[PDB]
């Protein structure tokens, strides 16, 4: 129980790519948060970042706004999305402001997770231990119509502001990853004590 920090630290190392982990550690230390003392926060950041990459790498985009999968596009001579999560927050805000300026659109008040070059919209991603619909409308309160929302729960429910933002195979990649993580956390008795994103 007091070893829950070390158990979560170890879990993180065994369940995520080194690249994912290093970014999350860096963002916590920007908030002057010790990952060793706030392991729940480190886990949540890792999952969030991994989901954003799972959404962004799924398709690529050409000059005229046509999308391709990685296989379809290879050799033709960018990722459909700019990933704003995963970098220091000062650099993140530079990116969001540049993207808005480049495209002649408003700059959202809050920091986005992704930017979709196809629709020219910012996207917020959320992962909840609770009901996705609840979290969705909680974010809507603050965000309004400034961004699209993609909310996923560990319990396989989800809520999307734009249903065409994910095919059923992309949804299945995200949700299956979350289901697998919850099963493992449950087996380690780490699930009940995890503080989800929706309570931060
Ligand atoms: Mn964010
Ligand atoms: Mn988010």
Give the whole-angstrom CA distance, residue 165 versus residue 162. 6
The 10 Å Cβ neighbour count of residue 169 is: 8
How many independent structural domains does the chain possess? Answer: 1
Give the whole-angstrom CA distance, residue 150 versus residue 81. 14
Give the whole-angstrom CA distance, residue 99 versus residue 105. 8
Q: How many angstroms separate the alpha carbon of residue 110 from the centre of ligand 2? A: 10
Three-state DSSP class for 123? strand
Which ligand places an atom closest to the C-alpha of 126? 2
What are the residues facing 200 on neighbouring strands? none
Give the whole-angstrom CA distance, residue 50 versus residue 93. 20
Resolution in A: 1.8
Three-state DSSP class for 188? coil
- Virtual CA dihedral for 120, 143, 86, 90, nearest 10 degrees? 100
What method was applied to determine this entry?
X-ray
Whole domain around residue 53: which residue ranges? 1-200
The 10 Å Cβ neighbour count of residue 165 is: 19
Three-state DSSP class for 77? coil
Q: How many angstroms separate the alpha carbon of residue 193 from the centre of ligand 2? A: 21
Three-state DSSP class for 161? coil
On the CB side of 88, how many CA atoms lie within 13 Å of its CA? Answer: 6
Which ligand places an atom closest to the C-alpha of 48? 2
- Taking CA atoms, 71 is separated from 54, 74, 78, 143, in Å, by 15, 6, 13, 35
């Amino acid at each position: 129980a007091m070893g829950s920090g070390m158990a979560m630290d170890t879990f993180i190392t065994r369940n995520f790519q080194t690249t994912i982990i290093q970014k999350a550690k860096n963002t916590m230390a920007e908030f002057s948060e010790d990952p060793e003392l706030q392991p729940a926060m480190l886990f949540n950041t890792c999952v969030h970042l991994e989901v954003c990459y799972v959404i962004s790498d799924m398709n690529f985009l050409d000059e005229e706004g046509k999308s391709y999968t990685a296989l379809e596009g290879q050799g033709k001579e960018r990722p459909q999305y700019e990933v704003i999560e995963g970098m220091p927050r000062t650099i993140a805000w530079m990116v969001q402001r540049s993207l808005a300026q480049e495209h002649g659109i408003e700059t959202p008040k809050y920091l986005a997770d992704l930017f979709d070059y196809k629709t020219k919209r910012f996207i917020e991603v959320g992962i909840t231990k609770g009901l996705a619909d609840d979290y969705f409308w909680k974010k809507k309160e603050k965000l309004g119509n400034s961004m699209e929302l993609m909310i996923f729960s560990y319990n396989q429910d989800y809520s999307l502001s734009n249903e065409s933002s994910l095919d059923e195979e992309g949804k299945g990649r995200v949700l299956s990853r979350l289901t697998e993580l919850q099963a493992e956390l449950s087996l380690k008795n780490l699930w009940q004590v995890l503080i989800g994103e929706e309570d931060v």
